Amino acid sequence: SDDVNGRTKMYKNIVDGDHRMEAGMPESFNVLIKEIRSLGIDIELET
């Protein structure tokens, strides 16, 4: 749930026969970033 590229790439792994389990990114957090940056408060990823 809450993905765009992760769900499509996972469905191909089930048909191929090997479960790669790609990481992806949840869509519930990508929306929260765009809503926070639009309020005048900064948020970034230091990594």
Q: Which two tokens stand for residue 12?
A: 């191909």
Nearest distance, CB of residue 39 and other proteins, angstroms = 6
Q: Is residue 9 within 8 Å of 22, Cβ to Cβ?
A: yes
Nearest distance, CB of residue 31 and other proteins, angstroms = 6
Hey, which residues between 1 and 47 contact other proteins (CB under 8 A)? 1-2, 4, 7-8, 10-12, 14-17, 19, 21, 23-26, 28-32, 34-47
Q: Is residue 27 within 8 Å of 4, Cβ to Cβ?
A: yes
Enumerate binding residues for other proteins (CB under 8 A). Answer: 1-2, 4, 7-8, 10-12, 14-17, 19, 21, 23-26, 28-32, 34-47
